[PDB]
């Protein structure tokens, strides 16, 4: 029958004790890790988090769990008897949360080969955390870290290793609303040293690039709109204008309110993000409109024919000057950040 073989091993007779470890008082046991990414979640910028759903596979060779009476190789087992094996401890350092699923049954896979190799697959959801540098907020490349350690065992007992081929496998068709996940991923070692001792650790890092599509429509084009709109003052009327003040102020005021929304979603940071310098420099240009007019207005009132001629002369010079100086700022700003 099927039943005795399941009972003969992993059973009270000739007892397999889960507490002890494979190759006890001997060389450290090798663990090979594979990760498959089912879905990549929302990267909420406010709380430095990104949700990841993965299948985690661990492969190791337990010499005790070996058989030769059954000729079939790699027989599968019920996930309901997983309690009586040695399983290697594993945890993610950068986590903030984790859970299993338990939809209908226990979503775990156990596979035992003839020699003793064991494959163990678990479905887990992770909310990891990523340090970020927002020096150039609209045009930036970010790095996300996946880091695996052992909690209760040192390198004299347990060592982690990455799989030789296909270590991290992205599901086909995965795409993010605001990030492109580059297919080049770097795998490196980062050993943890604490006062208790050394623990094994592996690290896989992803690179993400942010595209400038949404920001142009939402922010840059309305910001470029106002400064052009404020420019109407030069040809709107002659020097006699209460209205010329009116256009200038409402453009200045709405620029500040648009500034608040720009970083409202983003986390507060001391350093000067590249999005601020665009708004701050553009803020001066609309601000400079009123100062020019008051200089014009002052010249007009100082008449007590040559004075009036100067007032027009100021305008004509500045009609050509402002497009020129704005061009200089526009070419310099975009070139340096793209490079």
Known binding residues for glycine are 57, 121, 196
What CA–CA distance (Å, rounded) separates 152 from 331?
57
Strands 29-44 and 158-162: parallel
- Applying the rule CB under 8 A, the residues between 245 and 304 that interact with other proteins are 245-247, 249-250, 252-254, 256-257, 259-261, 263, 267-272, 276, 283, 287, 290-291, 294, 297-298, 301
Binding ligand NAG (rule: CB under 6 A), the pick from 5, 6, 9, 23 is: 23
Is 58 in contact with 191 (CB distance < 8 Å)?
no
Q: Which long-range contacts (CB under 8 A, 24 or more apart) does 191-196 make?
A: 192/93, 192/149
Stretch of residues binding other proteins (CB under 8 A), selected from 35-43, 136-144, 316-324, 329-337:
35-43
**Of the candidate residues 5, 9, 30, 201, the single one contacting ligand NAG (CB under 6 A):** 30
Q: Point out the annotated binding site for strychnine.
A: 194-199
Q: Restricting to residues 121-180, which ones interact with ligand NAG according to CB under 6 A?
A: 159, 161
C-alpha to C-alpha distances, 183 to 52, 89, 168, 216, 319, nearest whole angstrom: 17, 29, 10, 26, 51
Phi, psi of 163 (to 5 degrees): -70, 145
Within 10 Å of residue 173's Cβ, how many Cβ atoms?
Answer: 5
> How many CB atoms within 10 Å of residue 330?
11
Rounded CA gap, 309 and 299, in Å?
10
Question: Do residues 212 and 139 lie in contact, with contact meaning Cβ atoms separated by under 8 Å?
Answer: yes
19-58: which residues touch a second copy (CB under 8 A)?
A: 19-20, 24-25, 34, 36, 38-39, 41-42, 47-48, 53, 56-57
Residue 196 binds a second copy (CB under 8 A): yes
- Residue 106 CB-density burial (10 A; 0-12 exposed, 13-18 middle, 19+ buried): middle
Q: Which residues are annotated as a binding site?
A: 57, 121, 184, 186, 194-199, 207
Question: Using CA atoms, how far apart are residues 200 and 58, in angstroms rounded to an integer?
Answer: 15
Which residues 302-331 are close enough to bind other proteins by CB under 8 A? none
43 lies in the site for ligand NAG, by CB under 6 A: no
> To the nearest whole angstrom, how small is the minimum distance from the Cβ of residue 43 to other proteins?
11
Among 78, 141, 143, 321, binds a second copy (CB under 8 A): 78
Q: How far apart are the first and last CA of the chain?
A: 71
Print the binding letters for residues 111-130 with a second copy: x by CB under 8 A, - otherwise.
Answer: x-------x-xxxxxx--x-
Nearer to a second copy, 214 or 331 (CB): 214
Q: For strands 158-162 and 141-149, give the pairing.
A: unpaired
Residue 28 interacts with ligand NAG (CB under 6 A): yes or no: yes
Using CB under 8 A, which of 141, 187, 190, 212 touches a second copy? 212
Among 243, 308, 317, 325, contact with other proteins (rule: CB under 8 A): 243
Residue among 62 and 157 whose Cβ is closer to a second copy: 157
Q: Which residues bind ligand NAG (CB under 6 A)?
A: 23, 27-30, 159, 161
């Amino acid at each position: 029958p099927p039943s005795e073989f399941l009972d003969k091993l992993m059973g009270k007779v000739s007892g397999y004790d889960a507490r002890i470890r494979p190759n006890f008082k001997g060389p450290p046991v090798n663990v090979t890790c594979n990760i498959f990414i089912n879905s990549f979640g929302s990267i909420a910028e406010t709380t430095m988090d990104y949700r990841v759903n993965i299948f985690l596979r661990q492969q190791w060779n337990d010499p005790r769990l070996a058989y030769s009476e059954y000729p079939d190789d790699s027989l599968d087992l019920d996930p309901s008897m997983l309690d009586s094996i040695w399983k290697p401890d594993l945890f993610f350092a950068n986590e903030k949360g984790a859970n299993f699923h338990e939809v209908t049954t226990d979503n775990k896979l156990l596979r035992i080969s003839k020699n003793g190799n064991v494959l163990y697959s678990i479905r887990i959801t992770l909310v990891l955390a990523c340090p970020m540098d927002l020096k150039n907020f609209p045009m930036d490349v970010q790095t996300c870290i996946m880091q695996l350690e052992s909690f209760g065992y040192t390198m004299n007992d347990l060592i982690f290793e990455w799989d030789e081929k296909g270590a991290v496998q992205v599901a086909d068709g995965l795409t993010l609303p605001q990030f492109i996940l580059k297919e080049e991923k770097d795998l490196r070692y980062c050993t943890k040293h604490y006062n208790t001792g050394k623990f094994t650790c592996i690290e896989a890092r992803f690179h993400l690039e942010r595209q400038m599509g949404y920001y142009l429509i939402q922010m840059y084009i309305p910001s470029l709109l106002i400064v052009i709109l404020s420019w109407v003052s030069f040809w709107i009327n002659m020097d006699a204008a209460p209205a010329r003040v009116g256009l200038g102020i409402t453009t200045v005021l709405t620029m500040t309110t648009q500034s608040s929304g720009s970083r409202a979603s983003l986390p507060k940071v001391s350093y000067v993000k590249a999005i601020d310098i665009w708004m701050a420099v553009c803020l001066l240009f609309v601000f400079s409109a009123l100062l020019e007019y008051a200089a014009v207005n002052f010249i007009a009132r100082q008449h007590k024919k040559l004075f009036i001629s100067r007032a027009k002369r100021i305008d004509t010079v500045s009609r050509v000057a402002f497009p020129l100086v704005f061009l200089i700022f526009n070419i310099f700003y975009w070139i340096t950040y793209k490079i």
